[PDB]
Design a protein around this ligand. Structure first.
Ligand SMILES: [Ca+2]
Ligand SMILES: [Ca+2]
Length: 293
DNA sequence: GGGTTTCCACTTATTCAAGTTTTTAG
DNA sequence: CCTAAAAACTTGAATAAGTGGAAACC
């Protein structure tokens, strides 16, 4: 049974809402619809999706390609569990807007309005602002569509449990070995990073004040830009980052990465990272986590 | 029924995580 | 001199988001 707030944090990172508007000759109005919430992780973290399934008691798990496994909740009556959960523990990223559109589509389908032409039209208005919006085909079939085009979400971190769930999806624990002019010739630097699209810049900046450390770094690969929350000072890592995730446990394979990460921190704290024997020990831990776990 | 729901195999763009190297700080 | 901290990126795939086909409920 996973924590309810750890779940929303994880959903804020890996979850997504789906609204299908498909042409269907067998449908009276000519369009079939599907509404649901899904998560797609690497096969290594299939354990998470099975704990979420037991926690919610809804959804179906199926392989998504050769290296991924998904958990999709399309059973309409099951969506009441999704809605019930996200009302008590709401999302805080821009995905909350997707959820809000998700509820609107839900009410339209609950009243069976999606089986008449009017309901389909309102679904096209809802889907126009959801995720990547309307497809070229949909946009051509409904050229006279309009709507509010969604409002911007601006919330901040609720509690630590949400952070543990969000870090379990977007966090990264790195042991950076730097070719240094030190006696050993190798500096051991611990780095904790959270990466998120620039759409949630305000939430990313709040990490510094919320955690009392770190800095924001923007990057970009041509037309795409993202933000990274970085913590490299050991005192902040050993006194701020580590304690938070010890009391607020992570989930998935990243908990194993975080555990080896703390092992290296124990060596640094004892200053054994400056001994040739200690440096060799940290080099072995890095290989055990770069490959897996 | 057969219109509508539900589920499973599968595809695709990019937002992520993971990684290395060089420079400045103290 | 020397160790820590930050800078400044690069990389490719685990994501998010989506599509195709169809069994089978109610
Ligand atoms: Ca995400
Ligand atoms: Ca992840």
């Amino acid at each position: 049974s996973i924590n309810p707030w750890i779940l929303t944090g994880f959903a804020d990172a890996e979850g997504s809402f789906l609204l299908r508007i498909r042409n269907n000759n067998k449908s009276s109005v000519g369009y079939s619809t599907e509404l649901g919430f899904q998560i797609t992780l690497h096969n290594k973290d299939k354990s998470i999706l099975e704990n979420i399934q037991s926690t919610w008691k809804v959804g179906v798990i199926a392989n998504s390609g050769d290296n991924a496994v998904s958990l999709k909740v399309t059973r309409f009556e099951d969506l009441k569990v999704i809605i019930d959960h996200f009302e008590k523990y709401p999302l805080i990223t821009q995905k909350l807007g997707d959820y809000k559109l998700f509820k609107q589509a839900f009410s339209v389908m609950e009243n069976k309005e999606h089986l008449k032409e009017n309901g389909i039209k309102e679904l096209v208005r809802i889907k126009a602002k959801l995720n990547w919006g309307l497809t070229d085909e949909l946009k051509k079939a409904f050229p006279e569509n309009i709507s509010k085009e969604r409002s911007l979400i601006n919330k901040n971190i609720p509690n630590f449990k949400w952070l543990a769930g969000f870090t379990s999806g977007e966090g990264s624990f790195i042991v950076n070995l730097i070719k240094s002019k030190s006696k050993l010739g190798v500096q051991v630097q611990l780095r904790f990073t959270i990466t998120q699209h620039i759409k949630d810049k305000n939430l990313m900046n709040s990490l510094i004040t919320y955690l009392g450390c770190g800095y924001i770094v923007e990057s970009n690969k041509s037309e795409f830009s993202w933000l990274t929350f970085v913590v490299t000072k050991f005192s902040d890592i050993n006194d701020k980052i580590i304690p938070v995730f010890q009391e607020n446990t992570l989930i998935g394979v990243k908990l194993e990465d975080f555990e080896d990460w703390c092992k290296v921190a124990k060596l640094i704290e004892e200053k054994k990272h400056l001994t040739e024997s200690g440096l060799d020990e940290i080099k072995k831990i890095k290989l055990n986590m770069n490959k897996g776990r």
